[PDB]
Amino acid sequence: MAVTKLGINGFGRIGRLVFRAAFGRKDIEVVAINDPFMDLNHLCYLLKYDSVHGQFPCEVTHADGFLLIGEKKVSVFAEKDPSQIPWGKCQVDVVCESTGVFLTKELASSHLKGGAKKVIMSAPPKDDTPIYVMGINHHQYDTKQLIVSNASCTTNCLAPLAKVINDRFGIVEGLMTTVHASTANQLVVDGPSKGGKDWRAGRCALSNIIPASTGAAKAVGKVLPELNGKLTGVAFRVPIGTVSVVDLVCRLQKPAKYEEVALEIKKAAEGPLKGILGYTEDEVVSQDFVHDNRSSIFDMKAGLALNDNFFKLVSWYDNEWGYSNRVLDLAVHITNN
Amino acid sequence: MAVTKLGINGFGRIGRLVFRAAFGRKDIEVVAINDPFMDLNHLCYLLKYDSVHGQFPCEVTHADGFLLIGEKKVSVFAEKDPSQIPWGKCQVDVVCESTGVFLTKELASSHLKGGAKKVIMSAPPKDDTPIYVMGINHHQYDTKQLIVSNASCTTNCLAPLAKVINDRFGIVEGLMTTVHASTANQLVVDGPSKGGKDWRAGRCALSNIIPASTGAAKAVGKVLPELNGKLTGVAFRVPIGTVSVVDLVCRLQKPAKYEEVALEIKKAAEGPLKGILGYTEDEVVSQDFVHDNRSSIFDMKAGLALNDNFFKLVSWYDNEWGYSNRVLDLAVHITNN
Amino acid sequence: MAVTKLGINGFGRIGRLVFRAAFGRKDIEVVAINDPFMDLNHLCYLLKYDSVHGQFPCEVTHADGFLLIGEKKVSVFAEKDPSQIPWGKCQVDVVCESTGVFLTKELASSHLKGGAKKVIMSAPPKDDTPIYVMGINHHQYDTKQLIVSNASCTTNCLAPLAKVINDRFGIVEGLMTTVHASTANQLVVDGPSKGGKDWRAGRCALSNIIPASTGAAKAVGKVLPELNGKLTGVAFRVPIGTVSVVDLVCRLQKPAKYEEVALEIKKAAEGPLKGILGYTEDEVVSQDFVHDNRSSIFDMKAGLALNDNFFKLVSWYDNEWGYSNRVLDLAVHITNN
Amino acid sequence: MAVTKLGINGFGRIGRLVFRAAFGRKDIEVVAINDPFMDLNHLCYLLKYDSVHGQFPCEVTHADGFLLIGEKKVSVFAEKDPSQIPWGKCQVDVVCESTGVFLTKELASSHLKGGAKKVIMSAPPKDDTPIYVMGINHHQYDTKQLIVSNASCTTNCLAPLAKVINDRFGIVEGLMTTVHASTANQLVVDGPSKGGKDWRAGRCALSNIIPASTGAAKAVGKVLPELNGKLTGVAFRVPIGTVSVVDLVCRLQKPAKYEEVALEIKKAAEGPLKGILGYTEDEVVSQDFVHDNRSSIFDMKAGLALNDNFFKLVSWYDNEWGYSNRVLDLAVHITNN
Ligand SMILES: NC(=O)c1ccc[n+]([C@H]2O[C@H](COP(=O)([O-])OP(=O)(O)OC[C@H]3O[C@@H](n4cnc5c(N)ncnc54)[C@H](O)[C@@H]3O)[C@@H](O)[C@H]2O)c1
Ligand SMILES: NC(=O)c1ccc[n+]([C@H]2O[C@H](COP(=O)([O-])OP(=O)(O)OC[C@H]3O[C@@H](n4cnc5c(N)ncnc54)[C@H](O)[C@@H]3O)[C@@H](O)[C@H]2O)c1
Ligand SMILES: NC(=O)c1ccc[n+]([C@H]2O[C@H](COP(=O)([O-])OP(=O)(O)OC[C@H]3O[C@@H](n4cnc5c(N)ncnc54)[C@H](O)[C@@H]3O)[C@@H](O)[C@H]2O)c1
Ligand SMILES: NC(=O)c1ccc[n+]([C@H]2O[C@H](COP(=O)([O-])OP(=O)(O)OC[C@H]3O[C@@H](n4cnc5c(N)ncnc54)[C@H](O)[C@@H]3O)[C@@H](O)[C@H]2O)c1
C-alpha cells in the first residue's frame, strides 16, 4: 500500500541477504542498519562481495557516514545496545532483529524504545513470542502484536510440506531429519563452542557430519496447532555453503500412493502455496537451489513410500535466501495489516 | 585353524583397505592381487599412501614382479578377465571380488575356474547370491556355497541395529536415511555418470548434498527374514572422505522409553555383538570414526523418541574400514567352516 | 560482420560454458553439439543445471532430436569419431574441439573432413599447432591457418600480465606457481589416474593440496617470443569449484617501485587490454571471481616486491568462465579474419 | 637430564597437540593446563577427540578437578589473567604460551610472576623477543633468557631449507609463497575478522583461496642473520585440515643443477638436520604429511630450475604436528641448558 521502511539489526548472513533481497522489491526498503562489529568501510566490503550469492547487483559505496546503494542513503549505526538505535529518527516501520542474541520479547523491546514500530526476530523465539510462517498462518496475525518471530529456516521448509499432507491425508505422527549447510555459529577447526553448549558444533566444520538438535519440527505444531505434539526431529550439519534438505518420515491416517501424495503437493505448489512451496521431478542436488527464493521445494524422485501409510518425503531449501525473502514478506504484511 | 589365503580382485579403496586390514591379522593373509589398471609401480604407490587412513604401517616395495610387504611376497596380476587369474597357483582359499563389475554368480564364477576355492563379493549381489553379515547370520552359512556376498557398508551398519531392536521390542515398520561419505563412482565436476544411470551421482561431489537410492534397508530383510518388507530407505551423498551415518526411524510393537532402547543396544554392544556393534554417549562427529573397525556405533545422544513407539535411532560407520575388516572375518569363517 | 556458426565437440565444463557464454553474444551462435557420452535427455539436464555458474539463463528442452534453447534448434550428435560429425550440413564455421583427446593437427583435422571450416583446440596443442591468446597475438593470425589453439586457462591469465611487465620493465627471468581449482581429470577418492601418468592427480581431490606440472609459463614464450626460455612454473591443485590464482615471481631489467608496476598494469587494464586484463586493490578472494569473464585480474594488495628488481605478482582467473568467453572471441576473429 | 615440567596456556589446536606430542616423550611432561573458555568436562572432550589427528592414544578422564591421563594427574585452571596461574605451585619449568594474545615480553612475563621458570611463545613475537628454530640456532640460546619464541610454523619449514641452500650455494635473494591449511582465526561463513584487520581472513574458509600475509620469510633473517633482508613472501589460505606447503623461488650465487641442490638437501636430511628436515622423491600430496613430526620435508619432484641460478624449491609441513613437537624440543633444551 505504501513502501515499508525496514531497519536491520545484525548485518550478517541474514542481515545482508535480507538487504540484498529487498533491492528488487518496490513495496519495502531498508533505511537503517546497525552492527557494532564492522566499520562502515568493512560493512560495504561485506555487502559488496558474497562467497555464496555473488557480488551485489549494484554499486556499493559510503559517503559522510551513509551507505550508498546507487543514489539512496541508508543510515548506519554501531550500537551494541538495541535501545540506543535511533530507529524512530529513520521512521523504521519494522526492525529485522537478526543478531541472534535478542530472541526474547523483553530484549527485542528495546527496538520499540528506540522508535521502531514493530520487530521481527529472524530466528525462533526463546519466549512465547508469536511465530509466523508465510503462507501458513500469517493471515492470523494481530496488528496489536508489535513483536513477532519469522521462525527458523527449517520450520519454514517443513511447515508448508506438513500442512498440505496433513490437510488431505492427515498426519498421525512424524519424525524429521534435516541435512543442513554450514552456519556462522560453527568453527573452522576443533574448538570450544560458546557457553560450552552443543560441543559438537565446535568441531571442524570442513570435514565433519555434525549431529545437531532442532525444534523446527515441534515449532510446526505452534504454527499448525493440529500438529502440536505430532512431530519432532534432528539435524546433521554438513560442509555446504548453503541449501539444506528436510527429510520427513510420516504416517498418514488415510492411505495413499506415493503418486497421489506427490500430486497433492504439486497442486499446492501451483495453487495456494505458489511461491512458498515448490515442486520438482528433476534429478536435482543442493547447488541447484542456491539462491532459490522459495521456502521449500518438494523433491518427488528423492522420496518414497514403504506402504500405503508410511512415507519418506524430501524437500529442499536455501536456508539463507528463501528465509530472507520471507522476512521481507512478513515485514510488509504486519505493517500494512 | 590355519592361515586363510586371500586373493584380491580390484585393488581400490576396498581392495587396498582389506589388504591393509589383513596386515595385523594372524588368521588370514593376502597372497595375490589383481588389477589391470595400475602397473606394479603405480600399485605400490597407491598402497603406500592413503588420503584417509594414513601411510601403510610397513615398508612397501616391489621386486621381480612381486609386491614386497616387509619380507613377504605377494603375486600381482593385471587381468581384465577374472577367469584368467592364476588363483589356483597361489593356493587362494578365498577371492575378495571388489571391482564392482562381477556382482553375479555367473560372473564371479570365473574365479573358481581360475583355481580359487571360494569367492566373496565386496558388494550387494545383483543375483540371488547368498548375503551374509557378520554377527547376524554368518552362522547360517553352508560350506557348499562357494560364492557369497558380504553385503553393503550400509546394510552392515543397519543390520545389527535392527536385530537388537527387533529382537526385544519388535519393529513394525521402519524407514532409513543414510548420510554417506563420497565414493569412487562420483565425479569431481558436473559430468555424465556411467550408463546414464543415476544422473545425480555425476554432479560435483565437492559442493553438493546428493540424493541417492539404496537397497540396504530392504537387504536387511534378506539377512533377517523377520524383517522382510518392513524396511526401506534413501541416501544422501555428502563431501566427506569417509564415515557415514545411518538414521533409522522405526515403530515398535512393545512400548519403551528411549533410555530402555538405548540400554538394550548397549547391552548388545558389550555382549553378543561386541566388535560388530558399538555404543556411545559422547558428543561425536564423523571424523571420530575414521578407521573405526566396527560395523556400526550407536549414537545415544543423537537420537530421540517422539512417543513410546516411534523412534529415531542414529548409528555411525566408517564405510571403508569397518566393511573391509568384515570381509576378512567372513573370508576366514567360510574357509574354516 | 555476420553471425559465426559454432560447433562444439565435447560438451563438458568448457563445452557447456562456451555454449552458455554464447547465449548473450550476437556475433556468434552455437548450431551443433557432439558428445557420445550423454543421451539428449542427459545433455539437457547437464546444460540446465550447473553446480558453479547457476541454472541456464533460459529454458532448456529437446524435441525431435534437437536441443531447444527458447525457439532455436541446435543439432546434437553422439559420434566418438570426429570425422563422422556432419559439421558441414550445419554450416559450421568453427568447431570448438573441447574433448581433450584430439589435441594434434592430424586428429583435429577430422573436423574439416566432416565439413567444418576451422577448428579451435580448447587446450594446449601437443603438436606445433599455432597458439593464440586474445589481446596478445591474435592479430598475427593467418586466415589460411584452419587449426589453432586457444592455449590453456593459466597461459591466458599469465600472458597478459607478462606482456605489460615485459613491455615496460623487461623481464629477465621468472618462475610461476598457480594454485588451481579442481578439474575433471581428478578423482573423488584415491585411485589410479589414466595411463598411469601423473599419479598425484589420482589422489583424493576433496582433501589434498596436489602438486601438478604445467607448460603454461613456457607457453607464454610461444605467444610472446621475446619471453621464450625466460619463464616456467608449477601448479598446485586445491579443492575449489572454480577460480585459480597465478603467482609470478620475476626479475626486471629496469628498476621500479611496486606502485609503478601496479600503475603500469592498471593502465593496461583500463586501456589496450580492457576486457582481457583486470585490475583491483580490494581484499578479494577466489569466490569473488566466480563467473568473471576476464582472462586475468591483477591483485595489487596480494603481491609485493623484495627489492627494486625482484617482484611477486598475483592475478586471479576463473579457469572455466574467462577461458570459455575467450574461445568465442577467437572463434569470431578467425572467421571474420 | 631430568623430566621437564611443562605448563600449557591456551588449550587449542597447538596446546592440545603439544600435550598429545608429549605423551610419548620421557624427557618432558605436562603438569598444568590453563584455559578459561572450557569447563573440565569440555576440555577432556576436546582432548579426547580430534578431527585431524584421531582419538587420544590413551584414556582421558577427570576427577576431583584434575585431568587424568591414565594414572597421572594434571592441574587444570581457567584464568583469563596469566599472572593468576599457580605455575609455581606446580613446579612449571616452562610455560607454552599458546593463546595467541600474549606475544610480547611484558605480557608473557605474568607467567614468571605466577611462578613459572621460563616461557615459550608458540608464535612469532610482536616484541624483540628472542626467536629460536630447532636445528638452526637453538644452540645459540642463553640460559638467562627467560622468554623466547619458537617462531611460526612456516618459518620452521622454510628456515632449514634456507640454511642448507645458503650454506653451500648462497642465496642472493628469494621470494616465498606458502599454501596454508585452514586456521582457528578463520570463519565458517563470510563475516568481520577481529579488529577489522585482514578482512580476507573473514571470508568463507570452506570455498576460498584466501590471500594472506606472513613475516615467516623475513623471520628467517632473524634466525639466520646472513639472510636478513634477502627473503620475504606471501600466503594463500586454502580449505585443508592441516599440512601446508612452502614454495621458495631463489637465486643462488654459485651455479648448480637441480640434482645437485636436491642432493645437498638430502645429505642434510640424513645427516645434521635429520629429524628436522625431511627428503622425498615420491609423488606425495598434503594428506601424506598429516601427523608428520618433521619441520619440513623437501619434495624433490615438485620443484624445478629455470636455469643454473634460478630455482623453485618445494617443502611440506604439518603446521600443527611438527610445530608442536618442536615446542617440546625447545622446552627441554632451554631448561637443561
Ligand atoms: N544462515 C542461515 O542459514 C540461517 C537461516 C535462517 C535463519 N538464520 C538465523 O538468523 C540469525 C542470525 O544468523 P546469521 O547467519 O545471519 O549469523 P551472522 O553471525 O552471520 O550474523 C549476525 C550478526 O550479528 C551481529 N551482532 C552481534 N551482536 C550485535 C549487537 N549487539 N547489535 C547489532 N549487531 C550485533 C554480528 O556482528 C553479525 O554480523 C540466527 O538466529 C539464525 O537462526 C540463519
Ligand atoms: N568406498 C566405500 O565407501 C565402500 C564401502 C563398502 C563397500 N564398497 C564397495 O565395494 C566395491 C568396490 O568399491 P571401491 O570403493 O573399492 O571402488 P574403487 O573404484 O576404489 O575400486 C575398484 C577397483 O576395480 C578395479 N577394476 C576395474 N575393472 C577390473 C577388472 N576387470 N579386474 C580387476 N580389477 C578391476 C579398478 O581399477 C579399481 O582399483 C563396490 O561395489 C562398493 O559397493 C565401498
Ligand atoms: N575446467 C577448466 O578449468 C578448464 C579451463 C581451461 C581449459 N580447459 C580444458 O578444455 C579441455 C576440456 O576439459 P573440460 O573441463 O571441459 O572436461 P570435461 O571432462 O568436463 O569435458 C570433456 C567432454 O569430452 C567428452 N568426450 C570424450 N570423448 C569424446 C569424443 N570422442 N567425442 C566427443 N566428445 C567426447 C566427454 O564426454 C565430456 O563431456 C581440456 O583439454 C582442458 O585443458 C578446462
Ligand atoms: N594451527 C596451526 O597451524 C599453527 C601452527 C603453528 C603455530 N600456531 C599458533 O600458535 C598460536 C595458537 O593458535 P591455535 O591454532 O592453537 O589457536 P586456537 O584458537 O585453537 O587456541 C588458542 C587457545 O587460547 C585460548 N585462550 C584465549 N584467551 C585465553 C586466556 N586469556 N588464557 C588462556 N587461554 C586463552 C582459547 O580458548 C584457545 O583454546 C597462534 O599464535 C598460531 O600462530 C598454529
If residue C279 lies in a helix (H) or strand (E), which one and from where to where?
strand C277-280
- Number of residues assigned to chain B: 337
C240 to chain D, any CB pair closer than 8 A? The answer is: yes
Closest of A291, A295, A287 to residue A323, by C-alpha: A295
Residue D264, amino acid:
E
Tell whether ligand 1 has an atom less than 6 A from the beta carbon of residue A315. Answer: no
Q: Which chains, if any, share at least 3 CB pairs under 8 A with chain C?
A: A, B, D
CA dihedral (C88, C92, C95, C99) in degrees, to 10, reads: -60
What is the spatial distance between Cα A163 and Cα A23, in angstroms, rounded to a whole number? 31
Ligand 1: centre distance to CA A136 (Å): 24
Other Cβ atoms less than 10 A from the Cβ of D57: the count is 11
What is the spatial distance between Cα C89 and Cα C103, in angstroms, rounded to a whole number? 24
Nearest CA in chain A to D320: A189
Strands C4-9 and C66-69 come out as unpaired
Query: Does residue A215 have a known ligand-binding role?
Result: yes
Residue B235 phi, psi (nearest 5): -130, 160
Indicate the SS3 state at residue C268. helix
Cα–Cα separations (whole angstroms), residue D86 to C257, D9, D18, D96: 53, 12, 20, 14
C-alpha cell at A69: 546503494
> Which ligand ends up closest to the CA of C34?
3
What is the spatial distance between Cα A277 and Cα A164, in angstroms, rounded to a whole number? 10
What is the spatial distance between Cα D77 and Cα D116, in angstroms, rounded to a whole number? 14
Nearest CA in chain B to A299: B211
Q: Which residues contact C31 (CB under 8 A, 6 or more apart)?
A: C5, C6, C7, C74, C75, C90, C91, C92
Q: Is D31 exposed, middle or buried (0-12, 13-18, 19+ CB in 10 A)?
A: buried
Comparing CB atoms, the residue among C49, C50, C288 nearest residue A49 is: C288
CA-based nearest distance C29→chain D, Å: 33
Contact assignment for A179 to B304 by CB distance below 8 Å: no
Q: Is C278 exposed, middle or buried (0-12, 13-18, 19+ CB in 10 A)?
A: buried
What is the spatial distance between Cα C242 and Cα D148, in angstroms, rounded to a whole number? 43
C-alpha cell at A188: 573452522
Other Cβ atoms less than 10 A from the Cβ of D41: the count is 11
CA-based nearest distance D63→chain C, Å: 38
- Residue D180 in contact with residue D238, Cβ under 8 Å? yes
What are the residue ranges of helices labelled H in chain D? 13-22, 40-48, 105-113, 153-169, 216-223, 258-270, 321-333
Q: Is B135 exposed, middle or buried (0-12, 13-18, 19+ CB in 10 A)?
A: buried
Burial B177-213 (b: 16+ CB within 10 A, else e): bbbbbbbebbbbbbbbbeeeeebbbbbbbbbbbbbbe
User: Measured at the alpha carbon of residue D297, what is the angle toward residues D294 and D301, in degrees to the nearest 5?
Assistant: 165
D241 to chain A, any CB pair closer than 8 A? The answer is: yes
What is the spatial distance between Cα A80 and Cα A65, in angstroms, rounded to a whole number? 18
CA-based nearest distance B30→chain D, Å: 25
Which entry of D153, D157, D204, D250 is annotated as an active-site residue?
A: D153
Largest CA distance in chain D: 65
Closest of B28, C52, C188, D29 to residue A51, by C-alpha: C52
| DSSP string computed for C115-142 | T-SEEEESS--SSS--B--TTTTGGG--
Closest of A317, A231, A222, A311 to residue A277, by C-alpha: A317
- Residue A275 in contact with residue A294, Cβ under 8 Å? yes
Other Cβ atoms less than 10 A from the Cβ of C80: the count is 11
CA dihedral (C30, C36, C42, C46) in degrees, to 10, reads: -50
What is the spatial distance between Cα D80 and Cα D37, in angstroms, rounded to a whole number? 9
Q: What's the distance, CA B81 to chain centroid? A: 24
Residue C44, amino acid:
C
In A55-107, beta strands by DSSP E: 60-63, 66-69, 72-77, 94-97
What is the spatial distance between Cα C79 and Cα D152, in angstroms, rounded to a whole number? 56
Comparing CB atoms, the residue among C49, C285, C287 nearest residue A284 is: C49
Burial B95-134 (b: 16+ CB within 10 A, else e): bbbbbeebbebebbbbbbebbbbbbbbbbbbeeebbbbbb
What is the spatial distance between Cα D260 and Cα B324, in angstroms, rounded to a whole number? 44
What is the spatial distance between Cα B196 and Cα A166, in angstroms, rounded to a whole number? 37
Tell whether ligand 3 has an atom less than 6 A from the beta carbon of residue C156. Answer: no
Tell whether ligand 4 has an atom less than 6 A from the beta carbon of residue D318. Answer: no
C-alpha cell at B147: 560364492
- Residue B207 in contact with residue B187, Cβ under 8 Å? no
C-alpha cell at D297: 620435508
Across the strands, what pairs with D310? D251
Ligand 3: centre distance to CA B298 (Å): 44
Q: Which chains, if any, share at least 3 CB pairs under 8 A with chain B?
A: A, C, D
Find chain A residues with C-beta within 8 A of B175's C-beta. Answer: 249, 306, 310-312
Which domains does chain D possess? 1-150+320-337 (3.40.50.720), 151-319 (3.30.360.10)
What is the spatial distance between Cα A180 and Cα A193, in angstroms, rounded to a whole number? 18
Ligand 2: centre distance to CA B101 (Å): 8
If residue B14 lies in a helix (H) or strand (E), which one and from where to where?
helix B13-22
In chain B, beta strands by DSSP E: 4-9, 28-34, 60-63, 66-69, 72-77, 94-97, 118-121, 147-149, 171-180, 210-214, 231-237, 244-252, 277-280, 296-299, 304-305, 310-317
Tell whether ligand 2 has an atom less than 6 A from the beta carbon of residue B99. Answer: yes
Q: Is D110 exposed, middle or buried (0-12, 13-18, 19+ CB in 10 A)?
A: buried
C-alpha cell at C159: 600472458
Burial B140-153 (b: 16+ CB within 10 A, else e): eeeeeebbbbbbbb
Cα–Cα separations (whole angstroms), residue A210 to A37, A156, B285, D157, D238: 28, 22, 5, 33, 21
- Residue D209 in contact with residue C179, Cβ under 8 Å? yes
What is the spatial distance between Cα D30 and Cα D287, in angstroms, rounded to a whole number? 29
Closest of A76, A77, A45, A50 to residue A61, by C-alpha: A45
Helix crossing, C40-48 with C13-22: angle to 10°? 70
- Number of residues assigned to chain A: 337
- Residue D230 in contact with residue D170, Cβ under 8 Å? no
- Number of residues assigned to chain D: 337
Indicate the SS3 state at residue C146. coil
What is the spatial distance between Cα D137 and Cα D131, in angstroms, rounded to a whole number? 9
C-alpha cell at C155: 597461459
Ligand 2: centre distance to CA D30 (Å): 45
Closest of C26, C47, C27 to residue C38, by C-alpha: C47
> Which ligand ends up closest to the CA of A42?
1
What is the spatial distance between Cα C314 and Cα C244, in angstroms, rounded to a whole number? 11
Across the strands, what pairs with C173? C251
What is the spatial distance between Cα A83 and Cα A63, in angstroms, rounded to a whole number? 26
CA dihedral (D92, D94, D97, D102) in degrees, to 10, reads: 90
Which residue has a Cα nearest atom 36 of ligand 1? A10
Tell whether ligand 2 has an atom less than 6 A from the beta carbon of residue B100. Answer: yes
Find chain D residues with C-beta within 8 A of C249's C-beta. Answer: 175, 177, 249
Residue position matching grid coordinates 508410511: A310
What is the spatial distance between Cα D85 and Cα D113, in angstroms, rounded to a whole number? 9
What are the residue ranges of helices labelled H in chain C? 13-22, 40-48, 105-113, 153-169, 216-223, 258-270, 321-333
C-alpha cell at B172: 513394525
Closest of A327, A281, A304 to residue A156, by C-alpha: A327
Contact assignment for C285 to A51 by CB distance below 8 Å: yes
Other Cβ atoms less than 10 A from the Cβ of C103: the count is 18
Query: Does residue B20 have a known ligand-binding role?
Result: no
Helix crossing, D321-333 with D153-169: angle to 10°? 80
- Residue A161 in contact with residue B191, Cβ under 8 Å? no
Residue position matching grid coordinates 519403551: B256
Nearest CA in chain D to B241: D287
Residue D156 phi, psi (nearest 5): -60, -30
Sequence-separated contacts (24+) of B202-206 with Cβ below 8 Å? B202/C46, B203/A285, B203/A287, B203/C49, B203/C51, B204/A285, B204/A287, B204/C51, B204/C52, B204/C241, B205/B237, B205/B239, B205/C188, B205/C206, B206/B239, B206/C182, B206/C205, B206/C206, B206/C239, B206/C241
Largest CA distance in chain C: 65
Q: Which chains, if any, share at least 3 CB pairs under 8 A with chain A?
A: B, C, D
Query: Does residue B193 have a known ligand-binding role?
Result: no
Cα–Cα separations (whole angstroms), residue D307 to A224, A287, D252, D312, D329: 74, 46, 10, 10, 38
Q: Which residues contact C112 (CB under 8 A, 6 or more apart)?
A: C118, C119, C146, C147
Over its C-alpha atoms, chain C yields an Rg (Å, rounded) of 20
Find chain B residues with C-beta within 8 A of D284's C-beta. Answer: 49
Instruction: Give residues 148 to 187 of D whose Cβ lies within 8 Å of A.
Output: 182-184, 186-187
Tell whether ligand 3 has an atom less than 6 A from the beta carbon of residue C188. Answer: no
Q: How many CA atoms lie within 13 A of B255 on its CB side?
A: 3
If residue C296 lies in a helix (H) or strand (E), which one and from where to where?
strand C296-299
Which residue has a Cα nearest atom 31 of ligand 4? D80
Q: Is C11 exposed, middle or buried (0-12, 13-18, 19+ CB in 10 A)?
A: buried
What is the spatial distance between Cα C107 and Cα C76, in angstroms, rounded to a whole number? 21
CA-based nearest distance B92→chain A, Å: 39
Q: Which atom of ligand 4 is nearest to the CA of D99?
A: 24
Tell whether ligand 4 has an atom less than 6 A from the beta carbon of residue D10. Answer: yes
Strands A277-280 and A296-299 come out as parallel
Other Cβ atoms less than 10 A from the Cβ of A281: the count is 12
Contact assignment for A196 to D12 by CB distance below 8 Å: no
Q: What's the distance, CA A117 to chain centroid? A: 21
Strands C60-63 and C66-69 come out as antiparallel
What is the spatial distance between Cα D300 and Cα D293, in angstroms, rounded to a whole number? 19
Residue position matching grid coordinates 511461491: A275
Which residue has a Cα nearest atom 41 of ligand 4? D100
Residue D220, amino acid:
V
Q: Is A62 exposed, middle or buried (0-12, 13-18, 19+ CB in 10 A)?
A: middle
Q: Which atom of ligand 4 is nearest to the CA of D103?
A: 41
Residue D227 phi, psi (nearest 5): -110, 5
Ligand 1: centre distance to CA A123 (Å): 9
What is the spatial distance between Cα D329 and Cα A145, in angstroms, rounded to a whole number? 65
CA-based nearest distance C42→chain A, Å: 10
Q: Which residues of A are catalytic?
A: 153
What is the spatial distance between Cα C299 and Cα C280, in angstroms, rounded to a whole number? 5
- Residue A331 in contact with residue A96, Cβ under 8 Å? yes
What is the spatial distance between Cα C250 and Cα C172, in angstroms, rounded to a whole number? 8
Tell whether ligand 2 has an atom less than 6 A from the beta carbon of residue B80. Answer: yes
Over its C-alpha atoms, chain B yields an Rg (Å, rounded) of 20
> Which ligand ends up closest to the CA of D317?
4
Q: Which residues contact C207 (CB under 8 A, 6 or more apart)?
A: A207, B51, B241, C239, D240, D241, D286, D287
Is-catalytic flag, D250? Answer: no
What is the spatial distance between Cα C103 and Cα C106, in angstroms, rounded to a whole number? 9
Sequence-separated contacts (24+) of D183-188 with Cβ below 8 Å? D183/A188, D183/A189, D183/D237, D183/D319, D184/A187, D184/A188, D184/A189, D184/A191, D184/D12, D184/D13, D185/D100, D186/A188, D186/D210, D186/D237, D187/A184, D187/A188, D188/A182, D188/A183, D188/A184, D188/A186, D188/A187, D188/A188, D188/A205
Tell whether ligand 3 has an atom less than 6 A from the beta carbon of residue C215. Answer: no
Other Cβ atoms less than 10 A from the Cβ of C144: the count is 5
What is the spatial distance between Cα A145 and Cα A143, in angstroms, rounded to a whole number? 5
CA-based nearest distance D309→chain A, Å: 40
What is the spatial distance between Cα D270 and Cα D298, in angstroms, rounded to a whole number? 12
What is the spatial distance between Cα B98 and Cα B92, in angstroms, rounded to a whole number? 15
Question: What is the distance between the terminal CA atoms of chain C, rounded to a whole angstrom?
Answer: 10
Q: Which atom of ligand 1 is nearest to the CA of A34?
A: 33
D188 to chain C, any CB pair closer than 8 A? The answer is: no
What is the spatial distance between Cα B235 and Cα D171, in angstroms, rounded to a whole number? 56
Contact assignment for A232 to B304 by CB distance below 8 Å: yes
